[PDB]
Amino acid sequence: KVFGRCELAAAMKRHGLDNYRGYSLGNWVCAAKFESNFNTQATNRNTDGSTDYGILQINSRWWCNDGRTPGSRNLCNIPCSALLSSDITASVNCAKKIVSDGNGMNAWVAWRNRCKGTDVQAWIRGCRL
Ligand SMILES: [Br-]
Ligand SMILES: [Cl-]
Ligand SMILES: [Cl-]
Ligand SMILES: [Cl-]
Ligand SMILES: [Cl-]
Ligand SMILES: [Cl-]
Ligand SMILES: [Cl-]
Ligand SMILES: [Cl-]
Ligand SMILES: [Cl-]
Ligand SMILES: [Cl-]
Ligand SMILES: [Cl-]
Ligand SMILES: [Cl-]
Ligand SMILES: [Cl-]
Ligand code: NA
Ligand code: NA
DSSP: OBOOHHHHHHHHHHTTOTTBTTBOHHHHHHHHHHHHTTBTTOEEEOTTSOEEETTTTEETTTSOBOSOSTTOOOTTOSBGGGGGSSSTHHHHHHHHHHHTSSSGGGGSHHIIIIITTSOGGGGGTTOOO
């Protein structure tokens, strides 16, 4: 499913991401825009053989099982495919684990390079939230 900007912002808020570990909704919407252009089915293969999945492009080396990333963990206890669902619940729950990991949203390279320090509130402007 390709979310609308405000549609995703509402979904993320409903699932408790707004100010989760101190990160305002704009930050999560911005991260999703640049990770996946709001497409739950987005996937990208990494040089190391791992693959990133979903709206927030969560990686199979640590966080989900895809059956093809040798000697990886599955800290979110999910198949990576769950991260491609029109229902963002598994992506949200796994993202909460990741942002809790110690580097906050710096876990998402695109967040650090494209969102951090910017006016991220822009990403929820005009939304009924
Ligand atoms: Br509020
Ligand atoms: Cl947009
Ligand atoms: Cl915000
Ligand atoms: Cl993979
Ligand atoms: Cl990741
Ligand atoms: Cl394969
Ligand atoms: Cl593959
Ligand atoms: Cl594997
Ligand atoms: Cl393995
Ligand atoms: Cl949803
Ligand atoms: Cl953290
Ligand atoms: Cl932090
Ligand atoms: Cl409201
Ligand atoms: Na894995
Ligand atoms: Na695996």
